[PDB]
Amino acid sequence: KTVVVTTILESPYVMMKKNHEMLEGNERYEGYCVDLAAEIAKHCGFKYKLTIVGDGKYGARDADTKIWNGMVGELVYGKADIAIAPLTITLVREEVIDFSKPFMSLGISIMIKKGTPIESAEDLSKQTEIAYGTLDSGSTKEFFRRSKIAVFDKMWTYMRSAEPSVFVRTTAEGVARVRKSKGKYAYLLESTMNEYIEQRKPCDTMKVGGNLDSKGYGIATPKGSSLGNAVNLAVLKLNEQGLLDKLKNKWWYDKGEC
Amino acid sequence: KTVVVTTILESPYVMMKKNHEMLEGNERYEGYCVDLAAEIAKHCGFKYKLTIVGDGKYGARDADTKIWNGMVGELVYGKADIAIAPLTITLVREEVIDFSKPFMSLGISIMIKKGTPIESAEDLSKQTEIAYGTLDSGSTKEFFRRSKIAVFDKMWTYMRSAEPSVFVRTTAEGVARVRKSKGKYAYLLESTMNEYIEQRKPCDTMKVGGNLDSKGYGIATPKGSSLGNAVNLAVLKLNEQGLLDKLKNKWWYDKGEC
Numbered sequence A, B: 001k002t003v004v005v006t007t008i009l010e011s012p013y014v015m016m017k018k019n020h021e022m023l024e025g026n027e028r029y030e031g032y033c034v035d036l037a038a039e040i041a042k043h044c045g046f047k048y049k050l051t052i053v054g055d056g057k058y059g060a061r062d063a064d065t066k067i068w069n070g071m072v073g074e075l076v077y078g079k080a081d082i083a084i085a086p087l088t089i090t091l092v093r094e095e096v097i098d099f100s101k102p103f104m105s106l107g108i109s110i111m112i113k114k115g116t117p118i119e120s121a122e123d124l125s126k127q128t129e130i131a132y133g134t135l136d137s138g139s140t141k142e143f144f145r146r147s148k149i150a151v152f153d154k155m156w157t158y159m160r161s162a163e164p165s166v167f168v169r170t171t172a173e174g175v176a177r178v179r180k181s182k183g184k185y186a187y188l189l190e191s192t193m194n195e196y197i198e199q200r201k202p203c204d205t206m207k208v209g210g211n212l213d214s215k216g217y218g219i220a221t222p223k224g225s226s227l228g229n230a231v232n233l234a235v236l237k238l239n240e241q242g243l244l245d246k247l248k249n250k251w252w253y254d255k256g257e258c
């Protein structure tokens, strides 16, 4: 009866409260997705427990073992009832789990250390001085692997063969590498996260250019789950009553340090 | 079985071609949604007929009789098998029809005659010299009817009681009203249509401000349609292959005149 919610530690969606040691259950966490979970739970009339995905991944199918990892895996193998996180709606995932309508729009975007002479993906592709990479597991990497658009395939060819690895294990690892590399590393990441990091100290990064693509984050449930329909109606309700915009502002711009 | 597709005359989604005489059937029409129809038809593998919704409406539910009109009505009562149109995904609709994931994102925006002293919704609401309204039936009018945000309810209050009616039966009628009102009428409408008009001769209007909200267009099917799942996976496939971005560029900005 208590609904197990799988999610991921990724600011500002889900963060440990300063003092989580003294708190328990859901109280240990805070963020956009924590607020959204409370709201969905409330408008669906269920009680829930938040849990952080064990392997810290979003969800991909291993080619060899054909096994699903990450949050998607937790839903597929029945370890969780619902996932509320910055989880991208994709065709390959839609084939094994259900998604609500998107609660947030976004696209792949470019993060640079301020001053870097890059204005676009095309710019990145036509040069080698400035290295670039992505979160080495998720829909961003997958976007580039699969793309048939020339500029993106050109970038993918570079990135897959670059040594040392241009790929990073976490978003933070990616930001730090931008910040620390005197403008010789650029980072391709989802626009929402780019915009968030842009308003954080030391305020030395920026988003350049437009998004390379358009997609959305959705709340996921196991196929044929009994929560799917209600959860979906809830996201639509909360979007129309302005909540989702409220929450974006609270966690992005009301907190802005720049 | 040939699939009856319901849609609506709205540029650049569905428009009559210049030479539609001597053309027959699906060939009389061109537009973003026409190309969209064809591609979905190839990827779910069916044959279809394009038909323009008889009453020229998007879809709303008569409070009195509780009957659905517009394209939504045609799905609900079994007159059409699928709507492919700039149809907004909303809560009241998702309760009686099925939507695919969004094929396009957008928001309510303001259109002015060039030179009009308005920069935002607040500006509209704080004055009376300049009249304003919406498509008198659709998701936009409903957004204002329902809004609790002070500025939008302030506008709504004015709008509902305005004389003469500031509402219009078609986008075309709204734009003509802006163009001929010498700047005394501003028009609230979806960002996609606003962006398109701004790039067309006589090039005398402009989109001012940001979007007042965020949402999507989806393809709709009757609840429990066999087509439901297939079309959904098709929209995700097209978005990921970059086709949708291709169509948007072809129809919006390769067609610019200003």
Ligand SMILES: N[C@@H](Cn1cc([N+](=O)[O-])c(=O)[nH]c1=O)C(=O)O
Pocket: A010, A058, A059, A086, A087, A088, A089, A135, A137, A138, A139, A140, A141, A171, A188, A189, A190, A191, A193, A194
């Ligand atoms: N949303 C993604 C995971 N994911 C996250 C980030 N990020 O945290 O900004 C990214 O830059 N790229 C990516 O694929 C998923 O669903 O795979």
Ligand SMILES: N[C@@H](Cn1cc([N+](=O)[O-])c(=O)[nH]c1=O)C(=O)O
Pocket: B010, B058, B059, B086, B087, B088, B135, B137, B138, B139, B140, B141, B171, B188, B189, B190, B191, B192, B193, B194
């Ligand atoms: N997409 C809407 C209908 N609809 C369309 C336009 N338009 O064509 O830009 C508008 O300005 N307002 C509106 O409610 C829905 O489906 O009701």
Ligand SMILES: [Zn+2]
Pocket: A016, A020
């Ligand atoms: Zn800690």
Ligand SMILES: [Zn+2]
Pocket: A039, A042, A043
């Ligand atoms: Zn609530």
Ligand SMILES: [Zn+2]
Pocket: B039
């Ligand atoms: Zn195709």
